[model samples]
Target chain A: AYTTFSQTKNDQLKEPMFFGQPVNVARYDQQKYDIFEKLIEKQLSFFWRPEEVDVSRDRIDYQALPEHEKHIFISNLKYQTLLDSIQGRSPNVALLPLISIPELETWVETWAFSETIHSRSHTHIIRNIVNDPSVVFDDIVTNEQIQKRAEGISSYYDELIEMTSYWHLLGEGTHTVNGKTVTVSLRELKKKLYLCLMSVNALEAIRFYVSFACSFAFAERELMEGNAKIIRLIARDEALHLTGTQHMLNLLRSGADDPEMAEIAEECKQECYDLFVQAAQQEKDWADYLFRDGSMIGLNKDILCQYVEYITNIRMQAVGLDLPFQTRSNPIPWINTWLV
Target chain B: AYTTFSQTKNDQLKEPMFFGQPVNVARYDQQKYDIFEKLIEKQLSFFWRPEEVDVSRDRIDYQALPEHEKHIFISNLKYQTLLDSIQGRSPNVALLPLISIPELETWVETWAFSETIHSRSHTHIIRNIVNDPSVVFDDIVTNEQIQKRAEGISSYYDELIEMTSYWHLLGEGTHTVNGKTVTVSLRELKKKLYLCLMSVNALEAIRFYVSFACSFAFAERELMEGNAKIIRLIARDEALHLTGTQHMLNLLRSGADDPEMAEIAEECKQECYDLFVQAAQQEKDWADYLFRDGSMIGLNKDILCQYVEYITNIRMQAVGLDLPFQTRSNPIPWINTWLVS
Candidate 1:
């Protein structure tokens, strides 16, 4: 059992990540990992509330769009809406208990809480962009395209959570219940955690960037600028988020935090590589479906798909994965023009 | 398994307190419980950083202090330091997985994070107030009086946490592990949670108030006003915390939130009462210890002990426990003058 401060003579933190011992003291007078403290400072400095921005006028901007532009607008909004809906609560609920550092524990919650603000920002944007807000929100679950991504997106998180419940419920051993032997092991659970963090990195890195390109494309024509403004704020938050995932990956891979995690990162390399490719392919399929009815002036299925390939390459290398696809240059170079 | 938004079709949320079913989507566009949302708002409004307060003058004030007076001052600071230290992390680590609402979940993190700032404030304050801040900080572990209180406070939290681990790990179960049968029960866990919150309440309610008297008494004499100013700010946040615990108690006792918790509150009534008295008496004993060498002009052992019983009765009655003492009024009436009451 962990207290806020550990009374034991030994420093439990000097032990490996996950299952060494629970964190005892929340003292930041010093740290074994300073990156988490930096993340916390960066997160606190990046403090923002949805109320700080005014999306109220976008209701009028959204009403003026043509049907395809509406498709462009609402579809971009739906993807973003579902992304935060998963993000706002996932990190804290899933990752915190296994965390061994106070800095990391606080960083996880701070990151997740910021995502909640992003979730609210989406609701704020959706309420402005549509007359009946429920129309957009209701479609999030019912729309086949959005629901398809949700399954792929939530699968890793769901697996991690289920195993966490089983491990916490039944400690490491083979238990025979009702004619089946369910084996639980800490190493098996740590592998799930490492993969889950990778999955989240892919979600934040590629999936969100793809959606942001769509949102930015609308603003390139100087239309629905308010919605684009909100996405910019979400982008900034996602940058920190992407950095957090990379930090977790780097920490594990270096073998300083968890030796088992370093092994897990090595073991799951091919699986994580496939996950990024799978997610990018799924996102490309989404891009195709987004423009199947009609293409916007600047963005079309082919260009957006090329951007997905370009982004998947950069994101894959961040986690030490060798490039699976060699599409080096961004197809829509002007996407950076809108990022301004 | 719980997601931020559970896709699973659910039952009444005003049922089980924690570890019932994982909450699905965070639709605060609607709520079955509103108190958590209110606490969230209150916490947001009370948002502060330690740097906002100036503690520079505290250094000069410390230099002139008599040696024993310096001991009195730093010991009290260490005590506040330890209290906020536990508080900075406990609520989220201990209570979060059990929460079923988005507002409450966010509120739990927000509340705990704010305490982190308070912990940071201590380092900020101590680094300025003392020449060797490490001497002060290192003593928090070694100091006998503060260590005793830390054990009393942390043990209950550890108990709640152990039970939470049991409940969350293996729902309701009778399992043989290492040739021993361990029976994990939810009803038992809920009782631990109630008793733990009561102990937390005593920490914030009685102990913080006692410490605040020490802080404000110096300010009342027109000395160390900078440190007093920070304590005043901390006092304001503690009001929000005490209010948070009060709502938790009322929510559990009324059974309006969860029926099992209502029974849990009833079953733990005597245990809760005993915990409160134990905390109050321990505090009263501390007051005697603090005043052993010399008494300050405005405050002394007898008056401080009376104030403890006074606040204890009010806190006990707030949670529906029968009062054990007849301390109807505050012994230190003038202390309320500094508070926002």
Candidate 2:
């Protein structure tokens, strides 16, 4: 059902962002949505490498940190690495097979490729901070704290990719597999995709930002400036990544691009809101984990959790979701300095 | 069986290029093979955007061309567009699910991403030369000549992707789908992926180079210098791409990465040889179509066909395939001047 190159010549401008037709020609002369093209161009301009930022000083900076702070730093890097590892492959793995327009298809790729760059950054950071990099990378899968959330984060993408395989291989119908009747429907699959995108938006906009706040908190004290430099670059790209998702969600909910998707968006509104709340709570719990030993100077669990609530509300509002938390002023106003 | 991130971490260094545990970590500090990392680095260094090239003069350069020459230029572009269009997405779609190592995974992505840049460059060039790009872009899907080769070039990737979907979904063993039992095996899927890589090598090494010769021919007379500049960059990336696949094919056949693949490579030797020969003949036939209206000054159908044969022999030999055509020196050696410039 899915071909690498769909043979029929269809107007890409008339297609939906997903599930109309697999894009045949990767033409960017025009777009069904200009935001994605702009995102692609902005991402290209924002192109960077981890090696571009010198992390040599970070090695010494990391050594001088109090033992508890070291735990916070190393754990944060591992979590970032794990998230990027999933992200680097998930969008292309899950989204490319279903995307219909050329612009959005390219955007998804450009997004995933940059996530790979972020993954590379984690390797750079981890290798410098520790005597043996394997100790840090090895703990990523075995760590109790990181694995606790990994299933929740990966489940959404796994279901989407698996359902996509079924849709592509079996088409929309009831099928018997292993003596069980599995019903596959395009409408249900679209809902899964919609919810999956919401989960991803939360990943980029909320979860990653929480990690950034911790990274910048160290830099605000003139510590780990090199790591901060790389994270700042990552933050710039994440801004674009999160912006891409917000646009997708907003557009889908607006019913301008796909009427059925808008209906799906409305039906899934509460589920989407609950997703943001759950992600925000995880970050707060993560703050608790990060500060378990002791809080460093500029940040603590209370302050980090406040910023989580504040930023969560703002990101939620941007995507047309009602605020899940009470509106509060910026808890970490200096984060804006590093983020810019 | 296939999760976005495999929860259990395996040592990435020990994994084969395809069908190991799906890479849970995208670390690049180490690699099973250094060649892919090097290719990724080289491609990054060669990055250029179409807007930076300044194709403004090509609009005027294209106006002075005679009617048949216009047909040749536009047709060559439409064909190039179709090739890049398939190339930009196919690598990621077809290879990512199967690749086991991080460096090769990123290389496939970096490779595909650059093809998107080339696709964008075609848009830049065509939009410059014509008042309405729809007339050019639209013809890419409907043109009988372009469509004839599109399916053949896309077929390898399509089959590989479908097989990967099945492999990822049902895994190994016989599964009943719609009341028909289908056999799936890692060994056979590995063979399919190996053959797909070979087919890709031919497209990049053989088919794209054929179109490149036509572009360089125009620049030799100092016409459409702007378009020639863009094609030169595209050729540069294509060189790196073909090198990547060649290294992959060589590594697979060497019995070092996957022991079973060397056996698979030996078993599929004849099929691989015919794939290259088939791609070369198609390019030769494409030469007939390109020059059907009339040949431009330095290039003709016969010379292009000869170069096709010459390049096919050279490229085939590099991948350890015996030469299908008689060995000969480069027919258009001067083409190198435009290629590097």
Candidate 3:
């Protein structure tokens, strides 16, 4: 029941960020929330290309790495590639239909567009280092470690997308699909959106930063500097992205935009905390997998796990959620040098 | 059901442009169609910010204009705003769901992002000139002249999107929806996609360029040069955008990608011609609306109508459709100075 260009001349300033009206006109002249517009401006200012970085030297640095260190590097790259592959497409496909404001709609598209560039950056890094890029790209699906995390990451988005299709097709009601009653409610969808945003926040704030540690750890030991350079730019963009989602979550929680969403956020607080904890444990488990053979010079499973707990506490606390991990200091202070 | 990230590890190079496995991996190491990859690179290289242009001077120039000329300038900006408002969101909502190739998928996102920048540029220009930008922005939806074209423009995208939701949810079959049996077929969906792409092609090629002529016409008299500068940059990006849709249409028509799409192209030839002709007439009508009060120094209804005819013929021929207008030289030859491609 949504049109690409809704003809209603509703005042956009009165609309909620989502589910108010399908944004009829894309006008940035005003916004319900100006933060999205600011984010769009900052994101456009951070526009970058992976090819602009000289990753040519990364191939040589990679060839000189120890086998276990290579495993750490390649596995981290593969996971980064996976995160971006999903991030690149999911935001537009999942969020575009439900967004009701022009600023947020454009912000979602710009966010996804930047993720595609990050995906391109991965290919740029992979094609330079690996003998055959297909080996790295193809294994993303077959590799159990990567696939395990991908499942947890994509499940929230996939569920939201499926439920959205039904909602768009058959309004809010119990409908029989293939002779089975299925309930679709706006309140339930808002809960799904909240949980999904929490999951995405974990992705950008926790998962991507975990991978950035590995890339920068190599650079700390004076290896894969070009890859680190590109990751530095990616880190900058991810910082902006995480900030965007954090604002959305907090805004929803504050009940300033949608009162129902505020209730949904309070209802889903424990689930949101559990989501972050699960991601942290997954990253810690992934660290164990990365170091199963051997540990690198600057990074090991213990240190990476410690870093995971350290980041989870900070990111969780920022969004008005109780921290699940112990209060701890930075495990790898050197990563601060690389992150923008 | 469609997914945000498909888990199948199929070789993307072997996938067709659409209705294939949705792209699982976002690798650009290789492409099914390298032209899309090229377009992405060119578009990124052409990255711009609307705020970078100085439209501050245009405020003074705009206040000096006569009331009818003020009508021309503000009306033109409103029309440009309407086009981009639809464009900024339509492609991703309508086309991103069905795109099967990584290069093309990313190309569509990149193309839409640039349009957002164009939309922002309109806001940027309007904010500098008018005291209340909402007055101009709101008129875009309420103005009958603009809303008429908005209906025609959004119909293709809206229809394809509705049919796509069905195709994706129902998977090509007859279904009962609210006591109505609706037939959803892949062939029918493909036809919708083909016609939508043609409609989008006309939008970028014929429609956007027609507006560009009006924007540049003010600059021809050395008025609104700041606005002219920003539009020239937008024109540069539109050239790349039009090329992208043109390639999509041509490739589908050639049967090299989807043979069924090729058949659909042939089947819709007359409709395609009529689509172009109808768009040309709409633009001519829009031209009359723009010049209803008075004409500018270098542009009037008759000359703007001629330019529409000239552009429609060339843009229609680019996608292998028969020309719908009489052959003639450029009525506004100066617009070539602004168009990059």
Candidate 4:
């Protein structure tokens, strides 16, 4: 059902972002949405490599920290690596086959490619700070605490990918596969896409920013400054990534592009709200895990949890979701220095 | 059959390039094929945007040219746009599902992303030269001469992608789909992949370099320098892409990674020979179309065809295929001035 070079010629400006005629030609002189084109251009301009940043001093900084603080720091680094590893490949795998327009197709690729660079940064940071990089990378899968969160994060993408396979392979209908009746519907697939996008929004908006706060908190004390420097660059790129997905969700909800997607967005509003709240809760739980050894200077479970609440409201409101937490000021105002 | 995150904890260093356990972690601490890792690093280092190159004067240079020259320039560009338009999306769609290692998976995305930049550069050049950009873009699909070549180029990717859906869905067995019986075999899928890579290698190594020769020929006369500058950058990226496919094909044929692939490579040598020769012949026909109206100063049908034969031999020999064209010296030595040899 999906061909790399679709034979039919269709107007890209008239097509929706997904589930229309597959994009036959990749032209950027025009676009269905100018925001994606602008995002692509801005992302290209923000091109960077992890090796460009020096993480050499981070090894010495890491050596001087206390045992619990060392746990807090290494655990946070491992979680960041996990987030990037899933993100680096998922978007291209799940979204590439279904994209219908040129700008959005390129944006998905450009976005995923940028995530790979973030993945590279983690390896660079881990290799320099620890004697055995394998210890940290291997622990990411085997550590039950980390795997618990990975389950939540990867489930949405996995379901979407499986359903998409059915939709693309068998079309929309009920089918018997290995003695099980599996129903595949376009409406259901669209709903999955909507919720999956919400999960991704939370991943970028809430989860990544929470991790950024932890990394920057260290830089606030003038420790792990090199590592912080690299994370700061990652945060800068992620701000664009968040903006890209938020635009997609808002565009879908607005129904200006696809009316059925608009209905699906309204239908899935409660589920979307629950997804964001669940992600925020997971980040808080992760904050607890990061500090279970003991709190480090300038950051702890309580303060980190408060920051999660504050950022969740802001990111949720941007996508037309009701705030799950009460409005509050930034708990750590110093993060702005590292963010910009 | 394809999971975004595989649960198995296999050592990534021991996995084959294709059809092993899917990469669970995207780690770059080490690699089975360091060439892919090196390609990724080099491509990232060569990052560029279309707007960075100034094509302002091309509008004027284009306006002053006669009708024949304008036909030569715009038609060459339409052909290029078609190539990049196919290339920018095909690699990710066709190659990503089959790749088993983290470095190669990332390299495929990285390589495709750079092709999108090349596609954007075409729009940048076309928009600057023409009044209505749609005139050039619309003609890419409608132009018969361009579409003829497009069919040959896209068929390999389309066939590979079709067979892959079956391989991933039905596994290595016969299945009934819509009352039609189909066979999906791993051996056949691997052969498809090998031939497809050779087609891609020819596209980049020979088809793209031939087009670059036409683009640089105009620049030799101090015309369209901005377009020349962009093509130079595109050529630089294409050089790396050609190197990547060469490594893949050579690795597969050497049987160091997959021993069965060595047997498949030996069995398919004649088919591979025909594929390269077919691509070279199509490029020669395209040369005739480019110069039908008139020939530019440094290039013509005869000279371009000779260049095609020369390049086809060199690229074919690199991948262990028998040379199809008579070996000859380069007809356009000045292209070396533009290419970063």
- Off by more than 4 A, model 1: A1-5, A9-20, A129-144, A152-155, A158-184, A333-340, B2-5, B9-20, B131-134
For residue A24, give model 3's deviation from the true position in Å.
2.3
What are the per-model DockQ values?
Answer: 0.34, 0.76, 0.72, 0.59
Global local distance difference test of model 2: 0.87
Q: Go through the candidates in order and give the clash count of each.
A: 9, 0, 0, 0
**Which pairs in model 1 have colliding backbones?**
A4-A24, A168-B169, A169-B169, A169-B170, B5-B24, B5-B25, B6-B24, B6-B25, B14-B257
TM-score of each: 0.89, 0.98, 0.98, 0.97
At residue B15, give the lDDT of candidate 4.
Answer: 89
Q: Given candidate 2, what's the lDDT at residue B339?
A: 63
CAPRI-style docking class of model 3 based on DockQ: medium
Q: Give stretches of model 4 more than 4 Å off.
A: A176-181
Worst 10 residues of 1 chain B by lDDT: B8-17
Error of 2 at B99 (Å): 1.3
> How high a TM-score does candidate 3 get?
0.98
What's the best-to-worst order under lDDT? 3, 2, 4, 1
Recovered native contacts in candidate 2, as a fraction? Answer: 0.74
lDDT of 1 by residue, B1-341 (tens): 34445555454244455555655444445455677767766766676666678887888887787765666677788888888767766786677767776566666777777777777777777878767765776677667886675557778776776667656545687865545577888788878888888788888888888888888887888777878877877888788788878887788789777788888888877778888888888788877878778877688888888888888898888877888888567788888877764
The 10 consecutive residues of candidate 3 chain B with the worst lDDT sum are B173-182
For lDDT, candidate 1 versus 2, the one ahead is 2
Interface Cα root-mean-square deviation for all models: 3.6, 1.3, 1.6, 1.9
